[PDB]
Structure 1
Amino acid sequence: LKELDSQLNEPREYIQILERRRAFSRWLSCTATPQIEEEVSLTQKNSPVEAVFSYLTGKRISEACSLAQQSGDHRLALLLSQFVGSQSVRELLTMQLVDWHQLQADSFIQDERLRIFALLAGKPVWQLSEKKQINVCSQLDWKRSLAIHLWYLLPPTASISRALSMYEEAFQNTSDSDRYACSPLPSYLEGSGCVIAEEQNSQTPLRDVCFHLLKLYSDRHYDLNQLLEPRSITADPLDYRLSWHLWEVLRALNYTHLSAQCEGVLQA
């Protein structure tokens, strides 16, 4: 209604893909701000390094730089102030981390500060000379976990669908890597402590409606049944309020691969 709609010509698919990423690169901050603002309210007076990291996990680089000039961490503030474009700084920190590890100098730097340097260097996990690992996505929710993939682990020139697939590559079992991201779950199951113990009937593991919509945007033939099911939206298997109003928008957007039994069950 706003950016693309300024163009008095048919807006190219490339501009659409970019404004879709620019808008989602707001949404992944708006889904993160209130938890960052509580986390900072608690951490600021005990550890400014965790408060600076929390701001960076919501893209609040201006506030992270401001807090680093307020804490007495001025060459951290300078380093952060430049990180909004130049890939050279991501590669210079990639070398600096390789050198501190090989020289066994890493083990005289804060793990919390090495976590910031790993985030900036575009490293989701770092392996220290102690054999400690620093997972940059550790303790985080599923939205800030996906936001790290969209902002720090990729270029400005990648798609939403590559950030979403690199995030799905981060929370599943492989033969060759440990898991480092959390799983996408509905907001009523977040914080619960539920390690879903691989349910021996439920061959489809439950996820958030927001994740299913990001899959349908990444793949036009992705499932609609698990997307419209109320369990993806609410803690109630009887609340079809959003389910029907999502389908009667997807039907208007020319998605047509739902079953007539599934439309019948939704409408009834």
Structure 2
Amino acid sequence: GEQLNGSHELENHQIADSMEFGFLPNPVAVKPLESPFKVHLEKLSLRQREDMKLYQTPLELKLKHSTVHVDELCPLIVPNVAVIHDYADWAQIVKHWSLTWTLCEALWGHLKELDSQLNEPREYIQILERRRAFSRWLSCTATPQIEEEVSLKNSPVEAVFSYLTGKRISEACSLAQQSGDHRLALLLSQFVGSQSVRELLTMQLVDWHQLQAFIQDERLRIFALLAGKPVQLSEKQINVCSQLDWKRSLAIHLWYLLPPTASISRALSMYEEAFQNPLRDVCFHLLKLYSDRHDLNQLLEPRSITADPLDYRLSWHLWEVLRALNYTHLSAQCEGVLQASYAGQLESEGLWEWAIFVLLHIDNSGIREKAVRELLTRHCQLLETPKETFLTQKLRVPAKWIHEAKAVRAHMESDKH
């Protein structure tokens, strides 16, 4: 009768069963038939994927940089000195990830000029320095690619070209000298010279491509470079695009385009307009963001809705540095949204302390208060045990809030006051 009775219950209930709901500190539990409870404490997978984050010391160091001023009621970050540069220490130089942070730093992070100067030219000098670092870095990545190609090249002239891609004028000049291409060698030294020599050279190319039954393919390429507009001119090294890394080509533009006339941003933009890059390539998107200086935010949203090359963490870190730096301007709401999911991604990890810290950089006071409050009380037990964790409450959590959550803990604990 029990058997019949049970079946009776099921059909009316229309019961088939599986069950799952979020647990209070966002985990998931479903029915294990294997566990004795018949419930499984599922460690929610952490989307957040980054070694240093787990380590407590980075969080502490990170706090020192920030200056927390109260909101009116709650906390809020006011000065922040976070730099993409900082992250590098906590990363393998080899890792591509380090590359993204490093490049982002060279472009984005503020550059300091120790030497005193008159004033206005400082901007001029500073750009050169930044340009110098940036161009140098690109050469690092390109280097294996270029060198491999040169080793295979069966000519004297092509390599002289290849060295130039390397951004090594001197070696190319030397090779030219050795090759007997004496005249070319002299012209080569002109490179890195924004001089108006470009016009004469373009003239030479024009004259050639208006007759010139014969000119070496590579010699022309070198001339295309001195012209200053390598890929935006007629006798384009656009075709080269298939052959070399997009990055490799970008360097040529950066190195010879016309450094003085245009700013680093506009210049990079100039190159970018010419070629379309993999959407997925992270390194590439960063350049877009850099170049996009006038709609950085506007580009950011489309980067978001296209690929996920940017990790959740990076997006947040990027927004925060730029904002604090006054390097760029970003939507308060967009900035918060970026923060929220980061704060959440951290929470899922169980890194409540770190998660709380991030929550602080939230423009919306109402949202911040709710978010921080909810977390503090729920989690109050863990937050107490270490100084690093001590400092966390020390950040700017209101005193009432701290004890208040504590009180609730007591009632539950059944040991009060």
TM-score of the two chains, using structure 1 as the length reference: 0.62
Deviation of the 1:11 alpha carbon: 8.6
Aligned-partner Cα distance in 2 for 1:123–1:260: 40
Judge which range, 116-125 or 54-63, deviates more.
116-125
Aligned-partner Cα distance in 2 for 1:161–1:76: 31
Indicate the SS of the match to 2:133.
helix
Q: Deviations over 1:98-141 (max 9, x none)?
A: 22222333xx222222222222223435x9999x9974555221
User: Structure 1 residues 170, 50: CA separation in 2 closer, same or farther (over 3 Å shift)?
Assistant: same
Deviation of the 1:58 alpha carbon: 2.4
Contact 1:230 1:240 in 2 (8 A): no
Aligned pair 1:136/2:266, yes or no? no
Contact 2:194 2:258 in 1 (8 A): no
Contact 1:122 1:153 in 2 (8 A): yes
Deviation of the 1:170 alpha carbon: 0.8
Contact 1:94 1:121 in 2 (8 A): yes
User: Structure 1 residues 224, 217: CA separation in 2 closer, same or farther (over 3 Å shift)?
Assistant: closer
Q: Deviations over 1:61-102 (max 9, x none)?
A: 111112222333222222212333263432222222222222
Q: CA RMSD in A?
A: 5.7
User: Structure 1 residues 117, 2: CA separation in 2 closer, same or farther (over 3 Å shift)?
Assistant: same
Deviation of the 1:9 alpha carbon: 7.9
Deviation of the 1:148 alpha carbon: 2.0
Aligned-partner Cα distance in 1 for 2:326–2:234: 54
User: Structure 1 residues 46, 225: CA separation in 2 closer, same or farther (over 3 Å shift)?
Assistant: same
TM-score of the two chains, using structure 2 as the length reference: 0.43
Judge which range, 57-66 or 3-12, deviates more.
3-12
Deviation of the 1:263 alpha carbon: 7.1
Q: Which has the higher contact order (CA 8 A, sep 6+)?
A: 2
Deviation of the 1:52 alpha carbon: 1.3
Percent of aligned positions that are identical: 99
Aligned-partner Cα distance in 1 for 2:261–2:149: 31
Contact 1:101 1:129 in 2 (8 A): no
User: Structure 1 residues 128, 35: CA separation in 2 closer, same or farther (over 3 Å shift)?
Assistant: closer
Aligned-partner Cα distance in 1 for 2:223–2:199: 11
User: Structure 1 residues 257, 148: CA separation in 2 closer, same or farther (over 3 Å shift)?
Assistant: same
Contact 1:118 1:136 in 2 (8 A): no
Deviation of the 1:231 alpha carbon: 9.9
Structure showing greater Rg? 2
User: Structure 1 residues 48, 209: CA separation in 2 closer, same or farther (over 3 Å shift)?
Assistant: same
Q: Deviations over 1:160-190 (max 9, x none)?
A: 122222112212xxxxxxxxxxxxxxxxxxx
Judge which range, 253-262 or 143-152, deviates more.
253-262
Contact 1:122 1:152 in 2 (8 A): yes
Deviation of the 1:55 alpha carbon: 1.2
Contact 2:297 2:329 in 1 (8 A): no
Deviation of the 1:155 alpha carbon: 3.9
Judge which range, 210-219 or 160-169, deviates more.
210-219
Aligned-partner Cα distance in 2 for 1:103–1:48: 26
Aligned-partner Cα distance in 1 for 2:230–2:326: 38
User: Structure 1 residues 207, 58: CA separation in 2 closer, same or farther (over 3 Å shift)?
Assistant: farther
Structure 2 segments unaligned to the other structure (5+ residues): 1-110, 338-415
Indicate the SS of the match to 2:324.
coil
Aligned-partner Cα distance in 2 for 1:122–1:253: 33
Aligned-partner Cα distance in 2 for 1:166–1:123: 10
Indicate the SS of the match to 1:26.
helix
User: Structure 1 residues 233, 248: CA separation in 2 closer, same or farther (over 3 Å shift)?
Assistant: farther
Q: Deviations over 1:28-49 (max 9, x none)?
A: 322322212222222xx61222
User: Structure 1 residues 27, 164: CA separation in 2 closer, same or farther (over 3 Å shift)?
Assistant: same
Aligned-partner Cα distance in 1 for 2:234–2:336: 60
Contact 1:55 1:63 in 2 (8 A): yes
Aligned-partner Cα distance in 1 for 2:145–2:112: 29
Aligned-partner Cα distance in 1 for 2:299–2:335: 13
Judge which range, 151-160 or 234-243, deviates more.
234-243
User: Structure 1 residues 71, 165: CA separation in 2 closer, same or farther (over 3 Å shift)?
Assistant: same
User: Structure 1 residues 133, 19: CA separation in 2 closer, same or farther (over 3 Å shift)?
Assistant: closer
Aligned-partner Cα distance in 1 for 2:308–2:217: 42
Aligned-partner Cα distance in 2 for 1:121–1:10: 29
User: Structure 1 residues 217, 7: CA separation in 2 closer, same or farther (over 3 Å shift)?
Assistant: farther
Contact 1:104 1:129 in 2 (8 A): no
Contact 1:146 1:167 in 2 (8 A): yes
